[PDB]
Design a binder for this molecule. Structure first.
Ligand SMILES: C[C@H](O)CC(=O)SCCNC(=O)CCNC(=O)[C@H](O)C(C)(C)COP(=O)(O)OP(=O)(O)OC[C@H]1O[C@@H](n2cnc3c(N)ncnc32)[C@H](O)[C@@H]1OP(=O)(O)O
Ligand SMILES: C[C@H](O)CC(=O)SCCNC(=O)CCNC(=O)[C@H](O)C(C)(C)COP(=O)(O)OP(=O)(O)OC[C@H]1O[C@@H](n2cnc3c(N)ncnc32)[C@H](O)[C@@H]1OP(=O)(O)O
Ligand SMILES: C[C@H](O)CC(=O)SCCNC(=O)CCNC(=O)[C@H](O)C(C)(C)COP(=O)(O)OP(=O)(O)OC[C@H]1O[C@@H](n2cnc3c(N)ncnc32)[C@H](O)[C@@H]1OP(=O)(O)O
Lengths: 232, 232, 232
């Protein structure tokens, strides 16, 4: 529900964090707080791997449009910063993170999805940075998140042309790693997480950092300079 | 024709620039001048998007071989510089640029094609940097153009091995973004351009620059140091 | 055989170097020495292109596990250094290098494979950096080798998740360039090498260096600092 938008469930060697705000899983302050608290739970439980899911309608429609279009600049910037901080937290997470993309993933929803080690979606789910289409220049933090995953040509189209990807085109582009039928997206993600929990955790954590260090530093710059994009 | 190699046609929200020198659309001085004048026209008309096409035989066979093999170094270097300047102009263009690859695109023809935001070709059209095959080391400006679009492994083969791509292999590699039947390549490119004209133009222009800044600077270096590759 | 693990055969414009230690072509000191001596032969014979093959069981199972798990640090580090030096030698080789991946390629076997200009494998052959799975953090030299060839998303999974690729997934990822049936892998590699020998050799050598300079420097750093990864 809107006031209780995240659930946390431990299943043996994994933890499953599910977003369902009863709508489109907007990544506002309350959702970010709930997600950070759920990841805190995973930290305390020292789980072997993390699964993050959306609901039956979407993975996430991205940042909360209401806060963005409210005329109040500061809450908007804090929300953006918190969202990209969460992305940074997941990208640098010391356990394997598997995303269960259970519906469309748009804008920050797509950026968030792109922070999983392994991403599972169904063929019919749209993944898109629609920012340019609706009149927003893509923040550097979001650009660097996408740049880490998208092929060179997909990165060009996804950004400048707000291109929509799905299924085989998303897989080819690097917006997802695996396609499954809608009814087994979550199950496949859990199965994958259980497998990755069998990897050596220390080598995994060290290796993923080595494979991402440059992007993490650029994302950090994008987070810290976010206000400056808007002249604040 | 050879003396009148470019046409410019405004269609509602787009402008269509067509190369047809009656042969292989060689990118010599007269062609570059005509293309720059056509883009000047688009600038004055402030169109929503640009389509650039070849003729029924090729997109372009690249730089004019006659000028290259004439024994006169300076016209050769000026032609190269002008060609890569045109590439830079298109890559940084503030409106969406759609390439209608209406036949083969070889060497500078392929480099030029790689400057469109969206590239449409038919399955049978060869796209190739044949430089290494014919005894030329690829200029840095051309390397950086390709590096921005080609997957890591395609970039290796396209350069060092002068590999030819087409259709599905070109799409996979990042030498094109869309495949269409020969008879609708131009129509599909126009349709795409009309769509992209509906994107927010300011966000598009800003975002494409952010997504290309490093490549643009490297291409600029390649242009400015072009003479130095040949010890001049 | 184990004591005579490499053969060198000149065929017209190419040389064929075949690994067969009677087992899994482990890249220990004796194998590295034999390979370097075979490449020395190719240097003296000034061949048009190089083909490197495995045996009927594998391309290579990577570094010699016995030396790695012997409790003696220095032979282990020398072996690693020599292996990555060989990789560097092949990546910077002035003639086209074609890999005939005649079976699985695991860990350094996969890193070695990734040093060919053109890589041919059969659909059933596994290619995997299994380091994270078995408890090793991937060395920087190996990371940079893979980074030069793998798509952005394949690079993430191949490293942090020790993902196994094969056939179409290897081709898509950039772990190979061509798939052939097992019985013609070597023949196809030879045919390709003969073709590449027809490229202009000077332009090939210059162009491949330009297309790899950054990676070569990073690999060199990884080689020279290899001891430092282990605090030596
Ligand atoms: C850099 C940063 O990313 C900056 C930005 O945020 S730029 C803005 C990017 N965000 C968007 O444009 C929003 C994306 N939303 C969507 O694409 C679609 O709504 C969707 C695919 C998620 C859902 O599609 P669809 O099922 O057709 O539902 P749709 O009719 O569009 O809207 C569903 C409801 O959710 C609301 N909603 C949708 N997305 C929302 C969001 N991000 N925040 C708040 N509310 C949202 C709608 O206003 C509508 O509300 P209502 O039922 O109470 O009227
Ligand atoms: C860094 C820079 O890129 C440096 C360089 O330019 S390196 C040189 C790269 N360019 C080339 O090698 C040229 C590429 N050309 C081609 O690949 C092929 O000609 C093509 C695919 C474009 C056309 O193929 P095809 O239809 O078989 O025509 P083909 O017989 O080759 O030649 C067509 C005619 O155009 C000419 N021509 C072809 N390409 C030309 C070019 N770039 N400039 C001038 N003339 C050219 C031919 O000489 C022939 O002329 P003719 O009819 O008057 O004799
Ligand atoms: C950074 C660096 O890469 C650091 C590292 O080396 S980390 C370690 C990475 N290496 C490995 O884990 C080894 C990889 N090996 C394999 O994956 C598999 O053995 C293989 C696919 C190559 C062969 O599989 P399979 O046919 O099932 O044979 P398998 O039963 O595993 O072993 C075959 C035999 O070769 C041995 N062997 C396998 N790989 C070996 C290696 N790299 N070195 C030495 N011996 C090896 C086995 O111990 C066994 O020996 P035996 O017949 O005398 O008992």
């Amino acid at each position: 529900s809107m006031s209780d938008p995240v659930s946390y469930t431990r299943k043996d060697s994994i933890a499953v964090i599910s977003m369902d705000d009863g709508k489109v899983n907007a990544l506002g302050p309350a959702m970010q707080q709930a997600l950070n608290a759920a990841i805190d739970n995973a930290d305390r439980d020292d789980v072997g791997a993390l699964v993050i899911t959306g609901n039956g309608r979407v993975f996430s429609g991205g940042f909360d449009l209401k806060i963005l279009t409210s005329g109040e600049v500061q809450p908007a910037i804090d929300m953006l910063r918190g969202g990209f901080e969460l992305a940074y937290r997941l990208l640098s997470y010391p356990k394997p993170v598997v995303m269960a993309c259970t519906g469309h993933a748009i804008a920050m929803g797509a950026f968030l999805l792109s922070c999983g080690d392994h991403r599972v979606a169904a063929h019919a789910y749209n993944i898109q940075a629609n920012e340019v289409a609706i009149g927003m220049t893509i923040p550097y933090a979001a650009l660097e998140i996408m740049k880490l995953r998208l092929t060179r040509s997909a990165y060009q189209q996804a950004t400048g042309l707000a291109k929509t990807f799905f299924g085989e085109t998303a897989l080819a582009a690097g917006f997802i790693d695996e396609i499954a039928l809608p009814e087994v997206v979550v199950s496949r993600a859990e199965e994958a997480a259980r497998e990755f929990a069998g990897l050596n955790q220390h080598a995994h954590a060290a290796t993923k950092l080595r494979s991402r260090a440059d992007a993490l530093t650029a994302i950090r710059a994008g987070i810290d300079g976010i206000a400056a994009e808007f002249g604040l």
